Design a protein around this nucleic acid. Structure first.
Ligand SMILES: [Mg+2]
Ligand SMILES: [Mg+2]
Ligand SMILES: [Mg+2]
Ligand SMILES: [Mg+2]
Ligand SMILES: [Mg+2]
Ligand SMILES: [Mg+2]
Ligand SMILES: [Mg+2]
Ligand SMILES: [Mg+2]
Ligand SMILES: [Mg+2]
Ligand SMILES: [Mg+2]
Ligand SMILES: [Mg+2]
Ligand SMILES: [Mg+2]
Ligand SMILES: [Mg+2]
Ligand SMILES: [Mg+2]
Ligand SMILES: [Mg+2]
Ligand SMILES: [Mg+2]
Ligand SMILES: [Mg+2]
Ligand SMILES: [Mg+2]
Ligand SMILES: [Mg+2]
Ligand SMILES: [Mg+2]
Lengths: 70, 271, 117, 88, 100, 55
RNA sequence: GCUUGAGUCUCGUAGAGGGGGGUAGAAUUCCAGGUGUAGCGGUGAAAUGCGUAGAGAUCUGGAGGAAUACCGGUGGCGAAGGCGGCCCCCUGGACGAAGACUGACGCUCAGGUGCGAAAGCGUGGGGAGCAAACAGGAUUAGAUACCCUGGUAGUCCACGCCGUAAACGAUGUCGACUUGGAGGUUGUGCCCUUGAGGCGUGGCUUCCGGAGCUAACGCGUUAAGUCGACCGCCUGGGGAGUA
RNA sequence: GUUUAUUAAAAACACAGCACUGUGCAAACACGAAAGUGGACGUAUACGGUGUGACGCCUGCCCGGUGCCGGAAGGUUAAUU
């Protein structure tokens, strides 16, 4: 991630661009991913759980929006 | 190929042979032969200078062209034949002008292949060019230490030299031993590895096999008396000494190289 | 002595310690300061505050060079990732560009095994 | 698989006409044409097991087709094998 | 006898030899009954990343149709020619002659 | 169909740091994304596109 | 005899299918040198360890190995195991379009043969990272562990052997039949200007559900529903997949 | 297979195999005041030294001591001045 700051740009907005540009690239998330080895079985299992959660989340949300609570 | 002998008798159970059907079954090239006599480890004083040498089968030396100065004349490999004088085989080549010579057989060479020597030769195995014109990172064998002196490196059965760097007038070579050495770019080298890479897989199998090739038995220093060897004797099997050579020099670790002349060319030692 | 006007600041943010170093555009180190050596040990150095203090000590270590322009190089995660950079404002230092240089391998080397805590 | 031009020769050489492609003779000849051609492939690609699995299918199909010809017409079967130089 | 797409970058100091190399390479294929379907000299261009401490390279395009051996034997020449760096070849099913 | 030499269009599907934008964002079809990726990787090798912003 | 099962041919399509070779970038480690100075690293805390013989940090150059970020997706391919940079050579299979051809050539399969993760073994290489064993420092009543700093085999390549996994969908293979809804992926016909459209027709695939089935949980056109062909296997627990 | 010719033929020596270590070629090493010679008309799949001793399953822990290897900032230290 690269950000170029001019002479007239106040630091507050310039600083936030780093927090919004680098974080968008996922540097803080990618680095944590390679800190320790997730064994290939773990990768498939966690990805499988995420996929189930992603699909189940929409199913759960869609049904709830059509169901009254009070 | 490697063949394991069937255990039809002791001394034949453990014998492993290297059989090359491509080798010529007939007599060698007579005009390129000469007589070399066994010395038995004796120098001009008659004293045993090096031990464990003696006997063995009679051998006839064959002039092997280690220089390869025939430039611009293509040659064809007539045949591959056994060489008793070295681990590698020798390929008989015929220059189209009518001259025959012996060269070390590269890895993939076979009868009828095209080989050329010179500065403008193609980049193929068996071709000899100065390392100035040879691309870096290419495997070569039979490298000369000095221009025009003849190859002296990577001559064994499966040995080879890797050209790693080329800086100015010197080329740094990764020798088979693992040490890096500097040689002039004008020295010649032969592309490709040396043939008969299976020479290391053979097993002599029996004591007589070593004797056939002129290797006399080696006697341990422990079994010696104190007068003969520093390891000496002792009632029973006693050692109680730092291992040394029969002339008292410490062995098993002691560095021995003391050549201050050419340590400039040794960029890095083997280990 | 050299009186360089433009410099380069390297932030080696890490989960344990934060190292702040100031170097010219050519990468020749001028001065450095670290959280561990700033009176913080153990859990103390790990906090973001230790990162900002280390930045302050870095400014004094290079005030004799009289540098004005700075390049903030940031590597690795840690609470000192953002605290240290903001500390340069307390010193009034001027910067020209900010970039992320955290190593991101394309697989390759074997990462160490997980810790069964 | 097999070159289109090479396939054309076999269908005409072994088939009744240039349009009869389903005849048991052309199928056996076509399978034999590919089977022997793969000797060079497996001469040096010895561990290429996955494609060898397809080769054994060709061998099995050829065996099945030949047995069918034997039950239908023995005389016609004999001519096919001698011309193709198989069943050794 | 298939369609091929060849791209090769040469040392900028050798920008004066590129017309010569094109003729030699084109001659080799045409001698084997091949034919060139597209030729384009892209000029010196800025490199995305440095190669061997070098930042500018001369780009050319060469889409050809020739037998296996001539390209195979052409690859080996590409290897030892120090002027050319990082050449690529590709397989295509139909000849293409576009400006691109 | 997508050509690696069609370099003008490639930045529309890569970020500043050289990331390849996922299909979920760009909305490209699955088939085109596969060939698009091959084109991008092909261009990067020829130094036409950068692998990353650091070199 | 016949053409609907099965198969052949022509034209195309997608794909980490496989084997061989080459090459590219990021990163770690190591080596050399420059800037620079007292810490670095690590943990819940700490120590062992590394460092004034100049570490760590930072820059330049070089050597070498291994794996391919983003793309990337209950996405794709393969009989299974399994297979992810890019490029070339050799090659298996699947699928669609219409047309032609052969004319039951089919299904299953004891024994048999082949393939078969990881670990392991044999020989010869290679070895950056990681890491059984091992060593030390912690923790604890003890700690032959969990944690930390090091670290060998191994992990990699060539060829052979081993033939075992929760080798799982805990569900043998083939064929027919039986209400649906929402997606993914890959072909194809038609309507076409009212397209980042509209209606059909195939392959593979994910999720939820009807009848029915089931001890229940659940399965549910990809059946664990309704049938047919063939094979494998089970007969209380332990002893024992042991002698 | 070898050995105390002339009281010991053996479990001793050798042995193929294995391992460590030295050696980049004017190689190490060895015989020579030296020239030179062998190793070798060989070139690390080579050669020397050492221990073990086919093959099979294996070869654990300790570097304080002695030796060897590497570094060497510092202390001490010869001729010379
Ligand atoms: Mg000897
Ligand atoms: Mg011996
Ligand atoms: Mg005795
Ligand atoms: Mg005793
Ligand atoms: Mg750690
Ligand atoms: Mg077929
Ligand atoms: Mg069976
Ligand atoms: Mg394994
Ligand atoms: Mg092994
Ligand atoms: Mg550990
Ligand atoms: Mg089982
Ligand atoms: Mg599995
Ligand atoms: Mg499963
Ligand atoms: Mg089962
Ligand atoms: Mg259901
Ligand atoms: Mg048993
Ligand atoms: Mg006697
Ligand atoms: Mg007697
Ligand atoms: Mg003994
Ligand atoms: Mg021991």
């Amino acid at each position: 991630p690269v950000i170029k700051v001019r002479e007239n740009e106040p630091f507050d907005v310039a600083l936030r661009r780093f927090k919004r540009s680098c974080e968008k690239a996922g540097v803080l998330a990618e680095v944590r991913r390679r800190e320790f080895y997730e064994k290939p079985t773990t990768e498939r299992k966690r990805a499988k759980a995420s996929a189930v959660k992603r699909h189940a989340k929409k199913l759960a949300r869609e049904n709830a929006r059509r169901t009254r609570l009070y | 190929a490697v063949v394991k002998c069937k255990p039809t008798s002791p001394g034949r159970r453990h014998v492993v042979k290297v059989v090359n059907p491509e080798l010529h079954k007939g007599k060698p090239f007579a005009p390129l032969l000469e007589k070399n006599s066994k010395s038995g480890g004796r120098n001009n004083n008659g004293r045993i200078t090096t031990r464990h040498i003696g006997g063995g089968h009679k051998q006839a030396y064959r002039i092997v062209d280690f220089k390869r100065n025939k430039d611009g004349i293509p040659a064809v490999v007539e045949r591959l034949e056994y060489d008793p004088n070295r681990s590698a085989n020798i390929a008989l080549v015929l220059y189209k002008d009518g001259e025959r010579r012996y060269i070390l057989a590269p890895k993939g060479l076979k009868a009828g292949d095209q080989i050329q020597s010179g500065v403008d030769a193609a980049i193929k195995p068996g071709n000899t060019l100065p390392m100035r014109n040879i691309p870096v990172g290419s495997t070569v064998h039979n490298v000369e230490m000095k221009p025009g002196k003849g190859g002296q490196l990577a001559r064994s059965a499966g040995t080879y030299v890797q050209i790693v760097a080329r800086d100015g007038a010197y080329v740094t070579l990764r020798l088979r031993s693992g040490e890096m050495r500097k040689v002039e770019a004008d020295c010649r080298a032969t592309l490709g590895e040396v043939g008969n890479a299976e020479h290391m897989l053979r097993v002599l199998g029996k004591a007589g096999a070593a004797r056939w090739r002129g290797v006399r038995p080696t006697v341990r220093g422990t079994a010696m008396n104190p007068v003969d060897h520093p390891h000496g004797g002792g009632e029973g099997r006693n050692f109680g000494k730092h291992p040394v050579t029969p002339w008292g020099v410490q062995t098993k670790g002691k560095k021995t190289r003391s050549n201050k002349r050419t340590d400039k060319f040794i960029v890095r030692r083997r280990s | 002595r050299k009186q360089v006007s433009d410099g380069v600041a390297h932030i080696h943010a890490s989960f344990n310690n934060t190292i702040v170093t100031i170097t010219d555009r050519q990468g020749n180190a001028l001065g450095w300061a670290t959280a561990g050596g700033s009176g913080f040990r153990g859990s103390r150095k790990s906090t973001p505050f230790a990162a900002q203090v280390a930045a302050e000590r870095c400014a004094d270590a290079v005030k004799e060079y009289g540098i004005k322009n700075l390049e903030v190089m940031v590597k690795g995660p840690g609470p000192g990732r953002e605290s240290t950079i903001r500390a340069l404002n307390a010193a009034g230092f001027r910067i020209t560009n900010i970039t992320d240089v955290t190593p991101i391998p394309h697989n390759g080397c074997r990462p160490p095994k997980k810790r069964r805590v | 698989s097999l070159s289109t031009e090479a396939t054309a020769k076999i269908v005409s050489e072994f088939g009744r006409d240039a349009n009869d492609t389903g005849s048991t003779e052309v199928q056996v000849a076509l399978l034999t044409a590919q089977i022997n051609h793969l000797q060079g492939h497996f001469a040096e690609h010895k561990k290429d097991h996955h494609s060898r699995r397809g080769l054994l299918r060709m061998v099995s199909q050829r065996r099945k087709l030949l047995d069918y010809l034997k039950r239908k017409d023995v005389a016609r079967y004999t001519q096919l094998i001698e011309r193709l130089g198989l069943r050794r | 006898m298939r369609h091929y797409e060849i791209v090769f970058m040469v040392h900028p100091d050798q920008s004066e030899q590129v017309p010569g190399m094109i003729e030699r390479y084109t001659a080799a294929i045409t001698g084997a009954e091949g034919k060139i379907h597209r030729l384009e000299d892209w000029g010196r261009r800025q490199l995305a990343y440095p190669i061997n401490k070098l930042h500018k390279a001369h780009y050319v395009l060469m889409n050809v149709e020739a037998p296996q051996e001539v390209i195979d034997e052409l690859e080996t020449t590409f290897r030892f020619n120090d002027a050319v760096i990082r050449s690529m070849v590709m397989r295509t099913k139909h000849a293409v002659t576009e400006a691109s | 169909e997508i050509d690696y030499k069609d370099i003008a269009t490639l930045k529309n599907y890569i970020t500043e740091s050289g990331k390849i934008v996922p299909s979920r964002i760009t909305g490209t079809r699955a088939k085109y994304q596969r060939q698009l990726a091959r084109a991008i990787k092909r261009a990067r090798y020829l130094s036409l596109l950068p692998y990353t912003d650091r070199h």
